Structure formats: C-alpha cells, structure tokens
Amino acid sequence: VRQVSKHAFSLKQLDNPARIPPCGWKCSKCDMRENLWLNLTDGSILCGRRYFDGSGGNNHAVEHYRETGYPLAVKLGTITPDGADVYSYDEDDMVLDPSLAEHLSHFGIDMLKMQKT
Ligand SMILES: C[C@H](C(=O)O)n1cnc2ccccc2c1=O
Ligand SMILES: [Zn+2]
C-alpha cells in the first residue's frame, strides 16, 4: 504494498462535532452495521458497495463520494493503534494515510480506544 495517498497531507477536513463511539456503528442512511466507512473529509458514516449477489452494503459511501468528491474513507472496526483499512475513491486503491491519527482526532477518535471487528 500500500502506498501513501496523494490526499494524506493536503486533506481539508470539515468541523463535524458528532460524537463517534468506539463500536456498534450504523449507516446514517440504512440499517447496515458492517462494511461501514467514515469519510475523513466530513465525518459521514455510510455503508460499503453492494456485492454482485446483492449482499454487502447499500452503496451509501460510494454514492456520497460521487456527490462530493471526498476521496478518503476508513473502515470502522479495522482501526487499531497500528493503522486501519483506508480506501481512496479517486485513486481506486487501499492506501496509506500516515496522518490517520490526526484525521481521526479531528472527529474526536482516539485510535488506542477503537475496537477491532
Ligand atoms: C469504501 C468503498 C465502498 O465499498 O464504498 N470501497 C472499499 N473497498 C474497495 C476495494 C476494492 C475496490 C473498490 C472498493 C470500494 O469502493
Ligand atoms: Zn447504508
């Protein structure tokens, strides 16, 4: 392998004061509680793409990307002190965010307190 996102150091985050718990997240837009992605620009929590067999998510995170251009999302439940799964929609890859700890702090998340799913 994963390479540093071209957005890791230039990302401009919006001020979103909503409290984000350490576990038991929900899609803002549906019942989903798995394949939930936190968009690092706006703090939106939304579900991953639908699988070919119609399982998986309801496309809410990717729809939000197409509407906004906000490129980086981190998969809740993968955040450890060592890192997380971060996807970049405009680079179409799993990427490194060496600023991840800051990006998550901005929305009041402590990486040392999040729980592995
Ligand atoms: C976050 C995003 C989604 O599901 O909305 N996502 C996540 N992982 C991927 C892995 C490979 C190819 C595409 C995606 C993707 O769109
Ligand atoms: Zn959803």
Side-chain angles (χ1 to χ4, degrees), residues 17-18 20-30 32-33 35-110:
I20 296 169
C23 45
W25 306 281
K26 195 177 79 51
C27 196
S28 283
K29 286 211 195 297
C30 68
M32 282 304 288
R33 308 172 170 274
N35 301 353
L36 296 194
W37 300 80
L38 171 62
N39 193 308
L40 292 186
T41 301
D42 57 13
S44 59
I45 294 168
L46 296 175
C47 61
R49 277 174 183 275
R50 178 174 292 141
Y51 293 151
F52 68 78
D53 61 9
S55 64
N58 289 315
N59 297 317
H60 291 136
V62 65
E63 286 174 3
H64 193 61
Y65 163 65
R66 283 165 194 155
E67 289 289 354
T68 60
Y70 299 163
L72 289 193
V74 63
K75 180 172 176 174
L76 293 155
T78 73
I79 305 177
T80 81
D82 292 324
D85 287 351
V86 184
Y87 184 72
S88 167
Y89 281 104
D90 69 325
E91 299 162 291
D92 185 16
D93 260 324
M94 303 300 311
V95 295
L96 289 190
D97 179 5
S99 282
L100 189 50
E102 200 178 312
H103 289 156
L104 296 173
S105 290
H106 174 85
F107 300 123
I109 294 161
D110 176 9

